Amino acid sequence: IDINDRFTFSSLSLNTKVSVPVNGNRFFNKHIAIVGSTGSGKSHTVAKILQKAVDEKQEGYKGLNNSHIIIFDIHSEYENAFPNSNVLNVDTLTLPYWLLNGDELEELFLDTEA
Amino acid sequence: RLDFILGEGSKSVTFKETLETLISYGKDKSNITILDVSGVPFEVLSICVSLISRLIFEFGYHSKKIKRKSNENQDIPILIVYEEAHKYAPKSDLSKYRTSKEAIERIAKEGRKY
Ligand SMILES: Nc1ncnc2c1ncn2[C@@H]1O[C@H](COP(=O)(O)OP(=O)(O)O)[C@@H](O)[C@H]1O
Numbered sequence A: 001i002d003i004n005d006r007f008t009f010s011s012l013s014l015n016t017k018v019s020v021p022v023n024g025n026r027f028f029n030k031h032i033a034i035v036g037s038t039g040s041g042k043s044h045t046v047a048k049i050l051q052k053a054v055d056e057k058q059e060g061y062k063g064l065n066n067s068h069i070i071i072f073d074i075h076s077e078y079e080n081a082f083p084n085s086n087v088l089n090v091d092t093l094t095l096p097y098w099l100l101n102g103d104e105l106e107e108l109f110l111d112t113e114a
Numbered sequence B: 001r002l003d004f005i006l007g008e009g010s011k012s013v014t015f016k017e018t019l020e021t022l023i024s025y026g027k028d029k030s031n032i033t034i035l036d037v038s039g040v041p042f043e044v045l046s047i048c049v050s051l052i053s054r055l056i057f058e059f060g061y062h063s064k065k066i067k068r069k070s071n072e073n074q075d076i077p078i079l080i081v082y083e084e085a086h087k088y089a090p091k092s093d094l095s096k097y098r099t100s101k102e103a104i105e106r107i108a109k110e111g112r113k114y
Protein backbone atom coordinates (compact mmCIF):
# COMPACT_ATOMS: atom_id res chain seq x y z
CA ILE A 1 0.00 0.00 0.00
CA ASP A 2 1.19 3.52 -0.75
CA ILE A 3 1.81 5.77 2.25
CA ASN A 4 -1.05 8.11 1.27
CA ASP A 5 -3.60 5.29 0.92
CA ARG A 6 -2.61 3.50 4.14
CA PHE A 7 -5.42 3.08 6.69
CA THR A 8 -4.49 1.48 10.02
CA PHE A 9 -7.02 0.29 12.58
CA SER A 10 -5.37 -2.96 13.72
CA SER A 11 -2.03 -4.61 14.42
CA LEU A 12 -0.82 -8.15 13.82
CA SER A 13 -1.98 -10.67 16.42
CA LEU A 14 1.35 -12.50 16.75
CA ASN A 15 3.37 -9.26 16.55
CA THR A 16 1.81 -6.20 18.20
CA LYS A 17 4.65 -4.00 16.91
CA VAL A 18 3.64 -4.79 13.30
CA SER A 19 0.90 -2.43 12.16
CA VAL A 20 -1.37 -3.99 9.54
CA PRO A 21 -2.61 -1.34 7.07
CA VAL A 22 -5.39 -1.75 4.55
CA ASN A 23 -5.79 0.13 1.30
CA GLY A 24 -8.24 2.70 2.66
CA ASN A 25 -8.83 3.90 -0.89
CA ARG A 26 -10.05 0.37 -1.63
CA PHE A 27 -11.24 -0.54 1.89
CA PHE A 28 -14.40 1.58 1.87
CA ASN A 29 -15.74 1.96 -1.70
CA LYS A 30 -15.98 -1.80 -1.99
CA HIS A 31 -18.37 -3.04 0.66
CA ILE A 32 -17.19 -4.32 4.05
CA ALA A 33 -18.65 -7.34 5.85
CA ILE A 34 -17.74 -7.64 9.53
CA VAL A 35 -18.81 -11.05 10.85
CA GLY A 36 -18.40 -12.66 14.25
CA SER A 37 -20.38 -14.07 17.13
CA THR A 38 -22.06 -12.15 19.93
CA GLY A 39 -19.39 -11.07 22.36
CA SER A 40 -16.59 -11.32 19.77
CA GLY A 41 -16.25 -7.53 19.60
CA LYS A 42 -17.70 -6.60 16.20
CA SER A 43 -19.38 -3.49 17.64
CA HIS A 44 -15.94 -2.39 18.86
CA THR A 45 -14.39 -3.16 15.46
CA VAL A 46 -17.08 -1.10 13.71
CA ALA A 47 -16.59 1.76 16.20
CA LYS A 48 -12.79 1.73 15.93
CA ILE A 49 -12.85 1.81 12.11
CA LEU A 50 -15.23 4.78 12.10
CA GLN A 51 -13.25 6.68 14.75
CA LYS A 52 -10.12 6.18 12.63
CA ALA A 53 -12.09 7.41 9.60
CA VAL A 54 -13.22 10.60 11.41
CA ASP A 55 -10.16 11.96 13.24
CA GLU A 56 -8.06 11.64 10.06
CA LYS A 57 -7.67 14.72 7.86
CA GLN A 58 -5.60 16.25 5.05
CA GLU A 59 -3.88 18.43 7.75
CA GLY A 60 -4.39 21.56 5.64
CA TYR A 61 -7.50 22.58 7.59
CA LYS A 62 -8.98 22.66 11.08
CA GLY A 63 -12.49 21.33 11.60
CA LEU A 64 -14.64 18.43 10.43
CA ASN A 65 -13.51 16.20 7.59
CA ASN A 66 -15.70 14.82 4.78
CA SER A 67 -16.60 11.44 6.27
CA HIS A 68 -20.30 10.59 5.99
CA ILE A 69 -21.19 7.46 7.97
CA ILE A 70 -24.75 6.33 8.71
CA ILE A 71 -25.17 3.65 11.39
CA PHE A 72 -28.42 1.70 11.73
CA ASP A 73 -27.78 1.34 15.45
CA ILE A 74 -30.33 -1.09 16.86
CA HIS A 75 -28.83 -2.05 20.26
CA SER A 76 -28.43 1.63 21.34
CA GLU A 77 -24.66 1.31 21.76
CA TYR A 78 -22.89 3.71 19.37
CA GLU A 79 -23.97 6.82 21.30
CA ASN A 80 -21.05 6.30 23.69
CA ALA A 81 -18.47 5.62 20.96
CA PHE A 82 -19.21 8.90 19.14
CA PRO A 83 -20.20 11.56 21.71
CA ASN A 84 -19.92 14.43 19.19
CA SER A 85 -22.30 12.80 16.68
CA ASN A 86 -25.93 13.30 15.70
CA VAL A 87 -28.15 10.61 17.24
CA LEU A 88 -31.73 10.13 16.03
CA ASN A 89 -34.10 8.00 18.10
CA VAL A 90 -37.87 7.68 17.62
CA ASP A 91 -38.59 10.87 19.57
CA THR A 92 -36.28 12.90 17.29
CA LEU A 93 -36.52 11.23 13.87
CA THR A 94 -39.22 12.54 11.53
CA LEU A 95 -39.49 10.11 8.62
CA PRO A 96 -42.17 11.20 6.12
CA TYR A 97 -44.63 8.48 5.17
CA TRP A 98 -45.08 9.92 1.67
CA LEU A 99 -41.46 9.24 0.72
CA LEU A 100 -42.27 5.53 1.03
CA ASN A 101 -42.80 3.72 -2.25
CA GLY A 102 -45.84 1.59 -3.06
CA ASP A 103 -44.26 -1.59 -1.69
CA GLU A 104 -43.35 -0.01 1.66
CA LEU A 105 -46.72 1.74 1.96
CA GLU A 106 -48.57 -1.57 1.59
CA GLU A 107 -46.76 -3.13 4.56
CA LEU A 108 -47.26 -0.08 6.79
CA PHE A 109 -51.05 -0.12 6.47
CA LEU A 110 -52.46 -3.33 4.98
CA ASP A 111 -52.54 -6.81 6.42
CA THR A 112 -51.06 -9.50 4.19
CA GLU A 113 -52.36 -12.61 5.99
CA ALA A 114 -56.01 -12.07 5.02
CA ARG B 1 -66.33 -20.71 30.79
CA LEU B 2 -65.66 -17.09 29.75
CA ASP B 3 -66.31 -15.47 33.14
CA PHE B 4 -62.66 -14.39 33.41
CA ILE B 5 -62.89 -12.48 30.11
CA LEU B 6 -66.60 -11.54 30.05
CA GLY B 7 -67.94 -11.71 33.62
CA GLU B 8 -69.42 -8.92 35.67
CA GLY B 9 -66.10 -8.60 37.50
CA SER B 10 -64.29 -8.02 34.21
CA LYS B 11 -66.57 -5.03 33.59
CA SER B 12 -65.83 -3.36 36.93
CA VAL B 13 -62.13 -4.26 37.18
CA THR B 14 -59.76 -1.29 37.16
CA PHE B 15 -56.93 -1.08 34.64
CA LYS B 16 -54.57 -0.63 37.60
CA GLU B 17 -56.04 -3.72 39.29
CA THR B 18 -55.37 -5.86 36.21
CA LEU B 19 -51.64 -5.07 36.11
CA GLU B 20 -51.04 -5.65 39.82
CA THR B 21 -52.93 -8.95 39.53
CA LEU B 22 -50.84 -10.15 36.56
CA ILE B 23 -47.56 -8.95 38.10
CA SER B 24 -48.40 -9.63 41.83
CA TYR B 25 -48.27 -6.05 43.13
CA GLY B 26 -51.67 -6.35 44.82
CA LYS B 27 -52.52 -7.08 48.44
CA ASP B 28 -50.56 -10.36 48.28
CA LYS B 29 -47.14 -9.59 46.82
CA SER B 30 -45.19 -12.45 45.23
CA ASN B 31 -42.08 -12.72 43.10
CA ILE B 32 -43.60 -15.55 41.03
CA THR B 33 -47.01 -15.21 39.35
CA ILE B 34 -48.35 -18.55 38.10
CA LEU B 35 -50.82 -18.04 35.25
CA ASP B 36 -52.80 -21.29 35.22
CA VAL B 37 -54.26 -21.33 31.71
CA SER B 38 -55.28 -24.99 31.94
CA GLY B 39 -59.04 -24.44 31.93
CA VAL B 40 -59.02 -21.58 29.41
CA PRO B 41 -60.83 -22.60 26.18
CA PHE B 42 -58.55 -23.25 23.22
CA GLU B 43 -60.24 -20.74 20.91
CA VAL B 44 -59.77 -18.18 23.71
CA LEU B 45 -56.28 -19.24 24.95
CA SER B 46 -54.57 -17.34 22.12
CA ILE B 47 -56.52 -14.20 23.04
CA CYS B 48 -55.69 -14.29 26.77
CA VAL B 49 -51.98 -15.06 26.31
CA SER B 50 -51.60 -12.27 23.73
CA LEU B 51 -53.25 -9.66 25.96
CA ILE B 52 -51.22 -10.49 29.08
CA SER B 53 -48.01 -10.58 27.01
CA ARG B 54 -48.79 -7.15 25.56
CA LEU B 55 -49.87 -5.66 28.90
CA ILE B 56 -46.62 -6.77 30.54
CA PHE B 57 -44.64 -5.47 27.54
CA GLU B 58 -46.14 -1.97 27.65
CA PHE B 59 -45.67 -2.05 31.42
CA GLY B 60 -41.95 -2.29 30.72
CA TYR B 61 -42.27 0.07 27.76
CA HIS B 62 -43.98 2.81 29.77
CA SER B 63 -41.58 2.26 32.68
CA LYS B 64 -38.70 3.36 30.45
CA LYS B 65 -40.60 6.51 29.46
CA ILE B 66 -40.77 7.64 33.09
CA LYS B 67 -37.21 6.38 33.67
CA ARG B 68 -35.79 8.93 31.23
CA LYS B 69 -37.78 11.59 33.10
CA SER B 70 -37.01 10.28 36.60
CA ASN B 71 -33.32 9.49 35.75
CA GLU B 72 -33.08 7.27 38.84
CA ASN B 73 -32.17 3.60 39.29
CA GLN B 74 -35.54 2.09 40.24
CA ASP B 75 -36.33 -0.76 37.85
CA ILE B 76 -38.88 -3.57 37.70
CA PRO B 77 -37.27 -6.30 35.54
CA ILE B 78 -39.73 -8.90 34.29
CA LEU B 79 -39.10 -12.43 33.01
CA ILE B 80 -42.00 -14.24 31.34
CA VAL B 81 -41.96 -18.04 31.18
CA TYR B 82 -43.80 -19.84 28.36
CA GLU B 83 -44.25 -23.53 28.97
CA GLU B 84 -45.27 -25.04 25.62
CA ALA B 85 -43.62 -22.13 23.83
CA HIS B 86 -44.21 -23.82 20.47
CA LYS B 87 -47.97 -23.59 21.04
CA TYR B 88 -48.41 -19.84 21.50
CA ALA B 89 -45.54 -19.25 19.03
CA PRO B 90 -45.78 -21.67 16.09
CA LYS B 91 -44.10 -21.25 12.74
CA SER B 92 -47.40 -22.06 11.02
CA ASP B 93 -49.09 -19.03 9.46
CA LEU B 94 -52.59 -20.30 10.27
CA SER B 95 -54.86 -17.72 11.89
CA LYS B 96 -55.52 -19.54 15.18
CA TYR B 97 -52.37 -18.41 17.02
CA ARG B 98 -51.27 -15.19 15.27
CA THR B 99 -52.13 -12.90 18.21
CA SER B 100 -50.01 -14.86 20.69
CA LYS B 101 -47.25 -15.13 18.08
CA GLU B 102 -47.19 -11.36 17.56
CA ALA B 103 -47.15 -10.60 21.29
CA ILE B 104 -44.33 -13.04 22.10
CA GLU B 105 -42.30 -11.89 19.07
CA ARG B 106 -42.71 -8.27 20.21
CA ILE B 107 -41.05 -9.16 23.52
CA ALA B 108 -38.43 -11.13 21.57
CA LYS B 109 -37.29 -8.21 19.41
CA GLU B 110 -38.00 -5.11 21.51
CA GLY B 111 -38.34 -6.41 25.07
CA ARG B 112 -34.60 -6.28 25.83
CA LYS B 113 -34.59 -2.47 26.05
CA TYR B 114 -37.81 -2.31 28.09
N1 LIG C 1 -10.00 -5.19 19.89
C1 LIG C 1 -10.40 -5.46 21.16
N2 LIG C 1 -9.49 -5.57 22.15
C2 LIG C 1 -9.85 -5.84 23.42
N3 LIG C 1 -11.13 -6.01 23.81
C3 LIG C 1 -12.14 -5.92 22.92
C4 LIG C 1 -11.82 -5.64 21.52
N4 LIG C 1 -13.00 -5.61 20.85
C5 LIG C 1 -13.98 -5.85 21.76
N5 LIG C 1 -13.47 -6.04 22.99
C6 LIG C 1 -14.26 -6.32 24.22
O1 LIG C 1 -15.12 -7.44 23.96
C7 LIG C 1 -16.47 -7.17 24.31
C8 LIG C 1 -17.35 -7.63 23.16
O2 LIG C 1 -18.13 -6.54 22.66
P1 LIG C 1 -18.37 -6.41 21.08
O3 LIG C 1 -17.35 -7.29 20.40
O4 LIG C 1 -18.37 -4.93 20.75
O5 LIG C 1 -19.85 -7.02 20.96
P2 LIG C 1 -20.52 -7.78 19.70
O6 LIG C 1 -19.41 -8.58 19.07
O7 LIG C 1 -21.55 -8.66 20.36
O8 LIG C 1 -21.07 -6.66 18.85
C9 LIG C 1 -16.57 -5.68 24.60
O9 LIG C 1 -17.14 -5.48 25.89
C10 LIG C 1 -15.15 -5.15 24.56
O10 LIG C 1 -14.78 -4.63 25.84
Ligand SMILES: [Mg+2]
Pocket (backbone or CB within 6 Å): A042, A043, A075
Ligand atom coordinates in the same frame (compact mmCIF):
# COMPACT_ATOMS: atom_id res chain seq x y z
MG1 LIG D 1 -22.96 -5.66 18.84
